[PDB]
Amino acid sequence: IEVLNLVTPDSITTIELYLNTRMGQNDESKDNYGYSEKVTVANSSDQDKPTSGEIPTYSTARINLPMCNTLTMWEAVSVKTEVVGVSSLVNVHMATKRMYDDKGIGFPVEGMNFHMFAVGGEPLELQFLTGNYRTDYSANDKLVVPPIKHQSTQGLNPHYKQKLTKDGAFPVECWCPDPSKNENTRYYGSYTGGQSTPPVLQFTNTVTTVLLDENGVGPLCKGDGLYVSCCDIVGFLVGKDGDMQYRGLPRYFNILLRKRTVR
Amino acid sequence: NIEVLNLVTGPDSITTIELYLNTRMGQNDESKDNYGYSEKVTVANSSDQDKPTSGEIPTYSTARINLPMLNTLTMWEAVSVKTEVVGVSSLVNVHMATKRMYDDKGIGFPVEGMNFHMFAVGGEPLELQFLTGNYRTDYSANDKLVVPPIKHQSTQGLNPHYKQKLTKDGAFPVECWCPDPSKNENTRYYGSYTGGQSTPPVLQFTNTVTTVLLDENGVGPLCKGDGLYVSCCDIVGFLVGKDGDMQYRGLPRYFNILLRKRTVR
Amino acid sequence: IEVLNLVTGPDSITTIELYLNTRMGQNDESKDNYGYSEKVTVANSSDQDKPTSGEIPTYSTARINLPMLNEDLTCNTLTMWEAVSVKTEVVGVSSLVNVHMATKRMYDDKGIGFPVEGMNFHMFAVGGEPLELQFLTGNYRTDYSANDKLVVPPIKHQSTQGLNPHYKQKLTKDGAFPVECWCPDPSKNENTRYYGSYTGGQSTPPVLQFTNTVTTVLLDENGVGPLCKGDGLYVSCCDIVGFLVGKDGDMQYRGLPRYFNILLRKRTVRN
Amino acid sequence: EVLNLVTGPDSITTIELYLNTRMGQNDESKDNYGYSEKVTVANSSDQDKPTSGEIPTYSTARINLPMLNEDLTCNTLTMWEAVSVKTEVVGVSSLVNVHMATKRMYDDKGIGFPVEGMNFHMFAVGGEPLELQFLTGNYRTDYSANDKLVVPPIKHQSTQGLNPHYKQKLTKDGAFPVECWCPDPSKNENTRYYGSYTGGQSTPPVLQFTNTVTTVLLDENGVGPLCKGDGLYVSCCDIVGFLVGKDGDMQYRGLPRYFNILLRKRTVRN
Amino acid sequence: IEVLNLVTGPDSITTIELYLNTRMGQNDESKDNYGYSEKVTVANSSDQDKPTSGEIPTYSTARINLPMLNNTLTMWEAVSVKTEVVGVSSLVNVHMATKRMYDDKGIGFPVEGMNFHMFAVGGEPLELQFLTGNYRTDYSANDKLVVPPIKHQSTQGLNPHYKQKLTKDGAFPVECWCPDPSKNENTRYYGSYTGGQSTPPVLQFTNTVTTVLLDENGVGPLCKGDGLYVSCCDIVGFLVGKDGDMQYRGLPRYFNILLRKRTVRN
């Protein structure tokens, strides 16, 4: 894309949406919504076959935007995004393991934190990379995973790529953003690991993230499509008998766009 | 919402509002023992028998302040705020009747664990979204708590049919209500959470920090019907009794707000 | 105080240096355990919470006399000293590099002695009048009568576990106001700046910095610093860096001294 | 001796690449790739001889830049000057996995231990090999279980601090151990390197990934690494922690790194 | 000193480059425990607190002679420093003979616990204040340690009668000497402490960071008698032996200091 000038009233527009988490029980009408199923643990690396619904996936959505030598496209300028329902973590009376010889608080949701989001003019481009090349994903055929398995995929093998084109379908554990592509998408992410680690979270409606690149060009919405993706894991819920489930929270986006002429 | 015009200049164009809010950890009566704490935390046997006891549930603190009464109108516009947690030094106390370190010879455990700190300033009540860790939580032990009368599975995620307004102090549980980011155009909120079991509280206090409430366009919260809305929650951790029983501990918050006159269409 | 212009000329600025030693409970520099509290005790119940004499940290404070400015106190204008900035440091942080003291030790009595560790509390204030204090405690019933030299309210009440504005005081005495029940009153202190932090937990690593290259500006949003009433400069602080854990597990607060280097200038005020 | 920039079309160029991790099992056709072999522990400091493949090494590559063909007999020459780099750790999301054959929490009912503990992250971009200084926690370490490792031929007590007679250049991928080689601060004028270490036993890994951060490689004089012989040197190590096996066996886990480097032509004195 | 104009033009700037090796207690580079302390011992009681020889960390320091320079005189003025801790990557080693995780199947304990990092650059020796956690500490197992000749209860606080200047490498214990903030007008110092028992070390290394040494008036340390003084300490934790015995580990530090010629009144 050769980028021409901005169109100088009716030349900007806002898009609001939220994405609900995809931890593994992704049916809103059922119990454990917004959690994974019970986490299971492989007996050996060649019997690493997770149960259905115990694997978190990326959340994603495509939004439709309004529709010579010169053409106009929607340019994404900025985004205010925030994690919703952080305060739901101020809860230590649920049916959980508890502190101090069954006299103290219930363990709050705690441990692993993974927070990512992305905004672009096309689906987020993915790279396959996993901790265990032999992971068998066939307990849930709705997951999108490569048809073949190889030793090299525990590192970066560029023959194993994909595009985030489906909500609740791409496991975060084997797909990450492809840094060699995504020239038309902006992505930001963090991971805090460990076993019982304190979640450290913020929420405010005053923070704006500029999506313009180093030349003042935001993501350009191809075929007038805006692509928004995320994942937000805030820890594990610890059951009374020590069984554990991922907990994730939803994400909100407020995206400002403008009109931009291209060649 | 409101079509904004020019600022009013000259004398009497500025005013100030100073207040504090007391914590609402669950025992909220200032003449009862345990004021500024929750009652003892209890733990449900299963997720369909999740009924907290009366008073073990932290709620939001909030107040509405009447401001001076004043083609076009004039409204009070909130410009900035100096806000601080009060009584941080009270947590330097290890001689209370608590569990203690090192084979009963060491210090009392200080108040420690979960920290949750939020405050909001707006020209109307804080707009809320329901979201909970357990859609079945039964709040009927305390009929003063404001919660939805219908329980649904989808409220463990974001369901936008479950909204509310923060219009009563000491009644909206923090655990099920958060700021609605899809509204709150006329309010600024700021919040954080540090979890874990016995996590160190990390706290700061000073009278030298000003939070600017002006938005990207240089427009602060505009005070509808001459009302200013201030809300907060400040959990600093848990007090651990001798037998392991635990109570939330909260601290008060101070606000000093600067407001100016703004002309609107 | 109605504030006017700065006074210029070669006598317009002055500098004040001092340090304040810690007041952890054992506050006599000729005695053992100086710079620590006495052994911490633990109440049997909340209505028998009576700390032992010397187990309680208090604020360090001092009033410094400044050069006299006004001989005639019947003029339309007067001059006051105005605190512009302060360079302050915690002294002796390197002392915490010590794992050979008589302490509990790691790894079945073969490892290091526990270093001083746990709760940290750091605050300092510079003002032109005493730091104004608000009473707030974790236990309204706390009985201070083991040490009648502590300054505390004469009445107790449930409401003091929150903010009761009828329970206030001024920091007018070194080593006497307990940290656990007095904090800076944010509804006053118009003429003092304070800065404070707390890091809790049981065995928490202390995290401390020391340098001679950082200046804290004390001017407010309008460019006005603390104005020294009666030509008096008030400096206050507390610096708790953790607990020393004795061989049997008894524990003491440890504190460190603080240094202050303050720049002041002359300012004209209405009289 | 640096002079001014040159103008015109093709005064600029970009180089894009990634480097895979070198934790010990460095063969992409075999199991445990991207991990070390199980860590083993010496019985005494005079018998400290690690097994082959349990030892992390630096990743590195020389990249050929478009050739600057020119008369070598004149007053000036032209060099490629690295201006800036966008670099990120790839696959961070792979650490969101608690179902692998690992030790697990809460009396064998909870999650599998995620990859956790020691984190070591460095990258370097230069116009010649990264210059290395030898420094080890044990001077007696015996690397002779793997003769591919590049280490000094003699051992001396002084190598537990800085002995400047023990230096190297980082000229082979997967060969220079991290544990005994660090960047030499007394040289490397023509390289920029960045590093960090978070230690401890089971420490939460803290990681970020984005495509929006540029690292300026120009020094305080506005001069970037200058690529000798039209060669660009890129180096890294990204240890994200240990995998804990069911029985307590532990392996390093590392992750690949991406680089996108901007370079411009600069005139230098000949 | 009354500072006047800078000296301009050629040979008005110079650079100084050095490193300082750590002084953790075993400070003899030909011996096996170099760059560590001897094993830490723990006193039976505070009145019997006599550390063994070699288990005490001390400051590293050096004086560098600058080129001969000289109503008015010329002095060297330190403008900035680039400094880094060297050999951080050496802490990526969990196969040494040490205590280990998970019932003797897991990693060796890495070097961990207490971190203390400080450096100083000035035009005269760094001025010290005595302050200790235990006034009775008996240092006579090593009479090469420079400590006060007299002891008193008040030295667990700040007693300004107990001062020194950092004039010897590997001799002033870190546990009882700190920078004196009432002096050091002609030195810049920077330090941090992270304590705890087994705390993760958090360390950074880079050749791209410059520390400006000029004060608020644009004046850096002025090198009296053409002497530049550099001091540091870099403790990175403890090595835990198989039986639980522990020793301090330190790392060396590099400095690259830029100086300029400054005219001053005499």
Q: DSSP string of chain D?
A: -EEEE--STTSEEEEEEEE---SS---TTSTTTTBPPPP---SSGGG--PPTT-S-B-EEEEEEPPP----TTSSEEEEEEEEEEEEEES-GGGG----SSB-BSTTTTSPBPPSBS-EEEEEEEESSPPEEEE--S-TT---TT-TTS---SS--GGGGS--TT-EEE--STT-SBTTTEEE-TTS-TTEEEEEEEE-SSSPPPEEEEES---EE---TTS---B-GGGEEEEEEEEEEEEEEBTTS-EEEEE--EEEEEEEEEEEEE-
Q: Which residues contact B153 (CB under 8 A, 6 or more apart)?
A: A28, A29, A30, A31, A33, B135
As a residue count, chain D comes to: 270
- Taking the C-alpha atoms of residue E145 and residue E169, their distance in angstroms, rounded to an integer, is 10
Token pair 């600025």 is at which residue? C13
| CATH superfamily assigned to domain A1-263 | Capsid protein VP1,Polyomavirus (2.60.175.10)
Residues of E in contact with C92 (CB under 8 A): 129, 131-132, 158, 178
- Taking the C-alpha atoms of residue D141 and residue D178, their distance in angstroms, rounded to an integer, is 13
- Probe site for chain E from D135, D197, D242 (most E CB atoms < 10 A): D197
- Taking the C-alpha atoms of residue E74 and residue E223, their distance in angstroms, rounded to an integer, is 10
Q: Are D25 and D36 in contact (CB under 8 A)?
A: yes
Helix (H, G, I), strand (E, B) or coil at C258: strand
B87/C204 CB distance under 8 A: no
Helix (H, G, I), strand (E, B) or coil at B36: coil
Expressed in Å, this structure's resolution amounts to 2.1
As annotated, the binding site of A for Mg(2+) includes 16, 180
CATH number of B1-265: 2.60.175.10
The CATH-assigned architecture of domain D1-270 is: Sandwich (2.60)
Alpha-carbon Rg for chain B, nearest whole angstrom, is 20
Q: Give how far Cα C208 sits from Cα of C252, E118, E131, Å.
A: 19, 12, 16
- Is some CB atom of chain A closer than 8 A to the CB atom of B214? no
| DSSP β-ladder status, B211-212 and B73-85 | antiparallel
* CA D270 from centre of chain: 32
Q: Are D57 and D25 in contact (CB under 8 A)?
A: no
Residues of C in contact with B91 (CB under 8 A): 138, 198, 200
Per the DSSP assignment, residues forming a β-bridge with E72 are E265
- Taking the C-alpha atoms of residue C139 and residue C157, their distance in angstroms, rounded to an integer, is 9
Q: Are D167 and D215 in contact (CB under 8 A)?
A: no
Q: Are C116 and C239 in contact (CB under 8 A)?
A: no
Helix (H, G, I), strand (E, B) or coil at A124: coil
Token pair 């009302």 is at which residue? B227
Breakpoints of chain B, after residues (C–N > 2.5 Å): 70
Residues of D in contact with A111 (CB under 8 A): 111
Residues of B in contact with C39 (CB under 8 A): none
Judged on CB neighbours under 10 Å (0-12, 13-18, 19+), A78 is middle
- Taking the C-alpha atoms of residue A226 and residue A255, their distance in angstroms, rounded to an integer, is 10
Longest dimension (CA), chain C: 75
- Taking the C-alpha atoms of residue E78 and residue E14, their distance in angstroms, rounded to an integer, is 10
As a residue count, chain C comes to: 271
- Name the closest residue on chain E to residue D46, using Cα atoms: E97
Judged on CB neighbours under 10 Å (0-12, 13-18, 19+), C206 is buried
Read off the tokens for C51: 């700390």
- Taking the C-alpha atoms of residue A206 and residue B119, their distance in angstroms, rounded to an integer, is 13
- Taking the C-alpha atoms of residue E205 and residue E251, their distance in angstroms, rounded to an integer, is 12
Taking Cα atoms as reference points, which of B139, C92, C126 lies closest to residue E191? C92
Within 160-189 of A, beta carbons closer than 8 Å to D belong to 172-177, 179-180, 182, 185-189
DSSP characters over E164-228: EE--STT-SBTTTEEE-TTS-TTEEEEEEEE--SS---EEEEES---EE---TTS---B-GGGEE
Which of D16, D93, D101 lies at the smallest CB-CB distance from A175?
D93
- Name the closest residue on chain E to residue D197, using Cα atoms: E203
Fold of domain E1-266: Polyomavirus Vp1; Chain A (2.60.175)
Sign of the Cα torsion C94, C95, C99, C100 reads positive
- Taking the C-alpha atoms of residue B184 and residue B159, their distance in angstroms, rounded to an integer, is 17
Q: In what order do the strands lie in the sheet with A175-177?
A: A161-163, A125-128, A175-177
Indicate the DSSP class of residue A239: B
- Name the closest residue on chain B to residue C120, using Cα atoms: B92
- Taking the C-alpha atoms of residue E195 and residue E176, their distance in angstroms, rounded to an integer, is 16
Phi and psi for B155 in degrees, rounded to 5? -80, 0
Residues of D in contact with A42 (CB under 8 A): 99-101, 112
- Taking the C-alpha atoms of residue E136 and residue E151, their distance in angstroms, rounded to an integer, is 7
Interface contacts (A, B; CB < 8 Å): 189
Angle CA A61–A64–A69, to nearest 5: 130
Residues of A in contact with D21 (CB under 8 A): 155
CA end-to-end distance (rounded Å), chain E: 8
Read off the tokens for A106: 């219930």
- Taking the C-alpha atoms of residue A259 and residue A150, their distance in angstroms, rounded to an integer, is 45
Q: Give how far Cα A237 sits from Cα of A171, A245, D111, Å.
A: 20, 5, 10
The CATH-assigned architecture of domain C1-271 is: Sandwich (2.60)
- Is some CB atom of chain A closer than 8 A to the CB atom of D16? yes
Count the helix, strand and coil residues of chain E and give each as a percent rounded to the nearest 5: 5, 40, 55
Judged on CB neighbours under 10 Å (0-12, 13-18, 19+), E161 is exposed
- Name the closest residue on chain C to residue E193, using Cα atoms: C208
Angle CA E195–E200–E202, to nearest 5: 90
CA end-to-end distance (rounded Å), chain C: 8
Q: Are B60 and B166 in contact (CB under 8 A)?
A: yes
Sign of the Cα torsion D136, D140, D145, D150 reads positive
Helix (H) and strand (E) counts in chain A: 0, 14
Angle CA E1–E5–E8, to nearest 5: 130
Residue type at C245? Answer: V
Shortest distance between the Cα of A99 and any Cα of chain D, in A, equals: 13
Q: Kindly provide the b/e burial profile for residues B111-123, where b requires at least 16 CB atoms within 10 angstroms of the residue's own CB.
A: bbbbbbbbbbbbb
B194/A204 CB distance under 8 A: no
Q: In what order do the strands lie in the sheet with E163-165?
A: E163-165, E127-130, E177-179
- Is some CB atom of chain B closer than 8 A to the CB atom of A24? no
Q: Are B191 and B117 in contact (CB under 8 A)?
A: yes
Residues of A in contact with B235 (CB under 8 A): 90
CA end-to-end distance (rounded Å), chain B: 11
Phi and psi for E134 in degrees, rounded to 5? -150, 105
- Taking the C-alpha atoms of residue B135 and residue A31, their distance in angstroms, rounded to an integer, is 8
Angle CA C101–C102–C103, to nearest 5: 95
Taking Cα atoms as reference points, which of B130, B174, B134, B175 lies closest to residue B153? B134
Read off the tokens for A41: 């643990």
Indicate left, alpha or beta for D125 from its phi (over 0: left) and psi (-120 to 50: alpha): beta
- Taking the C-alpha atoms of residue C190 and residue D49, their distance in angstroms, rounded to an integer, is 67
- Taking the C-alpha atoms of residue B205 and residue C125, their distance in angstroms, rounded to an integer, is 11
Helix (H, G, I), strand (E, B) or coil at C182: strand
Method used experimentally: X-ray
Token pair 């936008």 is at which residue? B160
Indicate the DSSP class of residue E36: B
- Taking the C-alpha atoms of residue B139 and residue B26, their distance in angstroms, rounded to an integer, is 13
- Is some CB atom of chain B closer than 8 A to the CB atom of C212? no
- Name the closest residue on chain D to residue A185, using Cα atoms: D211
Q: Which residues contact E10 (CB under 8 A, 6 or more apart)?
A: none
- Taking the C-alpha atoms of residue C88 and residue C215, their distance in angstroms, rounded to an integer, is 8
Domain boundaries of chain E, sorted by first residue: 1-266
CA dihedral B74, B78, B79, B80 (to 10 degrees): 160
Read off the tokens for D61: 């590559």
